[PDB]
Amino acid sequence: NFICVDDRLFSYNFTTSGIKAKVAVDNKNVPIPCSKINEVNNNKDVDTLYCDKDRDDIPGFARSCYRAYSDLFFT
Numbered sequence: 096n097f098i099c100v101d102d103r104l105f106s107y108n109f110t111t112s113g114i115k116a117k118v119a120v121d122n123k124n125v126p127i128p129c130s131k132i133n134e135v136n137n138n139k140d141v142d143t144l145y146c147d148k149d150r151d152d153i154p155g156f157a158r159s160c161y162r163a164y165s166d167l168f169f170t
């Protein structure tokens with residue numbers, strides 16, 4: 096259950112607290128192209144990093160996460 100955003104793969108998790116988005120990264124923390132969206136969805140054993148203002152090692156991460164949350168309303 097991953098979608099494409101800014102050429103990145105994002106998933107969503109929730110509970111009784113809130114909905115958080117997480118991005119799929121390779122073992123170097125480089126996000127995985129949308130050109131591999133099919134394998135990621137079939138073989139879902141990938142590194143995932145939750146959206147967080149404090150995570151700094153992915154450029155434009157805050158913008159891609161905002162987009163992901165937006166796309167849950169303005170589809």
Ligand SMILES: [Cl-]
Pocket residue numbers: 121122123
């Ligand atoms: Cl790698």
Ligand SMILES: [Cl-]
Pocket residue numbers: 154155156157158
């Ligand atoms: Cl940003």
Ligand SMILES: [Cl-]
Pocket residue numbers: 154155
């Ligand atoms: Cl930037």
